Design a protein around this ligand. Structure first.
Ligand SMILES: CSCC[C@H](N)CC(=O)O
Ligand SMILES: [Zn+2]
Length: 544
């Protein structure tokens, strides 16, 4: 009955999708697929984050327009996400007419409401290229240790940190010219004006405990005004009435959430839903799946912007931790910085979806992809527990009973144990306690395989006159498989499709209350094959 708008953070348009991205998009997709299974109206929304100085400069280096460049990466991103079956209702771009009009609207409202301040700043400027330089486009000699060729505000030899104005003999990364300090008028969003409102939200108990605790540190330090403007040359949206000024990516990037939803509504011919979801009186729910590095932005700056422009605010933020590989930050030299596209050359999407889901919880803890454990857990849980219930039983049904399952359950008590678990498993999906859900599902899978072991179909099959017993045992196992695959349907979309083809039925959450009786199933080849460490070694080598 609910109306739900769910987002993932907008991926940066000048980088390939990697396993870190995939943790976020898989987490959101599992939750979204479960919400759809319970009958709610869900809109799963994302976009590419396509503006800014680095993108402008990279396009110039490539000799193409920024529009061509961001279009190519957007296609690359959506191909990768589609390969992992991330079920977006719309994937748009921050570089769109919808986002331009919404950015201009929100800015004009913030300005009229008194939340935009004008302030002159001083910044390093490349007089040959003719542009202000972000910190990382200034290089020079460390003022402390005198090591040359250091970038930005820190030295990678001695570890010192400093303003780039302290670099000795500074050079523009763009042109090699010596930069100089230049003044420019910038426009600032008066975030401090919203501190009391934001502190109330922090205390409300909606946010994760770990996020609320961190926000208290930020309030203690003191909220600051945030620069929302950039000087030309720039790739982005020009500020009305302010020639030569552009909106900084901070402003237009989250508005891209709104622009993507407006684009979806407009493409559908739906003239009511945008206001239904974004007006202040909305009864729809708005959720953002984000990582730790995006929490300050989504928990303070973004709700303040929405409040100041008369829009509704997020219902909640769902924050996940970083991905590690073999216990450590991804390492290019070790081959553990793994692109999504590369992953799919070696493994399927379901394997990573399952492994992440088994490790995820409602907390912000980092998620470790241990590659040895990945092989063991996928083979143990998917091949040998869940799929085993189908593969060990289907052959007898197809070959000796014409594909027809028994007309009654052999063990109705055991079946009720499986269906009785739906409430706790569903609540685990709902609360984002994914690891809890998987633990209960695999505990049931162990029960199901213990049942089959106890009945010993490999013995019954050879014994004269026991055809009825064999059909009963094998049909019971297949009905337990039906239930487990329903509980796993949000996690494993492609295996589920193969399971539905075998079972000759769509898997619905409520359907488990009616077992398959006197029901024809189809043959299948192999629902899910084993993986091995040679494949992991090939993935690592291909990523170096
Ligand atoms: C509106 S969400 C914007 C997210 C930024 N692109 C940061 C990131 O993708 O890591
Ligand atoms: Zn140094």
């Amino acid at each position: 009955a609910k109306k739900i708008l769910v987002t993932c953070a907008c991926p940066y348009a000048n980088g390939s999708i990697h396993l870190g991205h995939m943790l976020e998009h898989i987490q959101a997709d599992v939750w979204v697929r479960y919400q759809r299974m319970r009958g709610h109206e869900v809109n799963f929304i994302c976009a590419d984050d396509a503006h800014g100085t680095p993108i402008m400069l990279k396009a110039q280096q490539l000799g193409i327009t920024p529009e061509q460049m961001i279009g190519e990466m957007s296609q690359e991103h959506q191909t990768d996400f589609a390969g992992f079956n991330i079920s977006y209702d719309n994937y748009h771009s921050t570089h769109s007419e919808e986002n331009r009009q919404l950015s201009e609207l929100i800015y004009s409202r913030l300005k009229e409401n008194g939340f935009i301040k004008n302030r002159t700043i001083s910044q390093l400027y490349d007089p040959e290229k003719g542009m202000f330089l972000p910190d990382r486009f200034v290089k020079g000699t460390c003022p402390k240790c005198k090591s040359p060729d250091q970038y930005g505000d820190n030295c990678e030899v001695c570890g010192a940190t400093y303003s780039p104005t302290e670099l000795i003999e500074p050079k523009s990364v763009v042109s090699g010219a010596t930069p100089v300090m230049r003044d420019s008028e910038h426009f600032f969003f008066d975030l401090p004006s919203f501190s009391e409102m934001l502190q109330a939200w922090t205390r409300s108990g909606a946010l994760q405990e770990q996020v609320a605790n961190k926000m208290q540190e930020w309030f203690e330090s003191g909220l600051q005004q945030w620069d929302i403007s950039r000087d030309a040359p720039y790739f982005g949206f020009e500020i009305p009435n302010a020639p030569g000024k552009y909106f900084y990516v901070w402003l237009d990037a989250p508005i891209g959430y709104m622009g993507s939803f407006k684009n979806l509504c407009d493409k559908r011919g739906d003239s009511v839903s945008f206001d239904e979801y974004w007006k202040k009186d909305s009864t729809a729910e708005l959720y953002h799946f984000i990582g730790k590095d995006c929490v300050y932005f989504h928990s303070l700056f973004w709700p303040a912007m929405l409040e100041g422009s008369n829009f509704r605010k997020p219902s909640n933020l769902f924050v996940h931790g970083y991905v590690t590989v073999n216990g450590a930050k991804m390492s290019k030299s070790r081959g553990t910085f793994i692109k999504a596209s590369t992953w799919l050359n070696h493994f399927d999407a379901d394997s990573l979806r399952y492994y992440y889901t088994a490790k995820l919880s409602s907390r912000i803890d980092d998620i470790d992809l241990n590659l040895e454990d990945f092989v063991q857990r996928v083979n143990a849980d998917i091949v040998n527990k869940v799929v085993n219930l189908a593969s060990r039983n289907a052959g007898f049904i197809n070959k000796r009973f014409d594909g027809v399952l028994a007309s009654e359950l052999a063990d109705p008590q055991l079946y009720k144990t499986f269906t009785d678990a739906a409430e706790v498993i569903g609540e685990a999906w709902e609360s984002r306690e994914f690891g809890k859900a998987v633990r209960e599902i695999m505990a049931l899978a162990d029960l199901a395989n213990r049942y089959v072991d106890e009945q010993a179909p490999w013995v019954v099959a050879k014994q004269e006159g026991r055809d009825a017993d064999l059909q009963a045992i094998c049909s019971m196992g297949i009905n337990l498989f039906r239930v487990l695959m329903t509980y796993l349907k949000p996690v494993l979309p492609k295996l589920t499709e193969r399971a539905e083809a075998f079972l000759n039925t769509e898997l619905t959450w409520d359907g488990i209350q009616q077992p398959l009786l006197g029901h024809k199933v189809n043959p299948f080849k192999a629902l899910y094959n084993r993986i091995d460490m040679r494949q992991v070694e090939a993935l690592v080598e291909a990523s170096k």
